Design a protein around this ligand. Structure first.
Ligand SMILES: Cc1cc(=N)c2ccccc2n1C
Ligand SMILES: Cc1cc(=N)c2ccccc2n1C
Length: 60
């Protein structure tokens, strides 16, 4: 990908606990590890995602 994900980007992510997709924002990126932390919109919980697993915001 030419464009890089950055902190503050809106995305969708698969929640580890149920396998369903939810809207999220990137809070941090580990440039070497190609991982990030996402904050789930409305729930407010956060968890690690590989950058390669982030989706553009669903149904937007
Ligand atoms: C029920 C529920 C509880 C959560 N704490 C949560 C967090 C992040 C994304 C989805 C989530 N859902 C669906
Ligand atoms: C739908 C979509 C897919 C992409 N891979 C992407 C990449 C970079 C910027 C916008 C993007 N959008 C909007």
């Amino acid at each position: 990908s030419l464009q890089q994900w950055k902190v503050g980007d809106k995305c969708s992510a698969i929640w580890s606990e149920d396998g369903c997709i939810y809207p999220a924002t990137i809070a941090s990126i580990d440039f070497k590890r190609e991982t990030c932390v996402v904050v789930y919109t409305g729930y407010g919980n956060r968890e690690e995602q590989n950058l390669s697993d982030l989706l553009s915001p669903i149904c937007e």
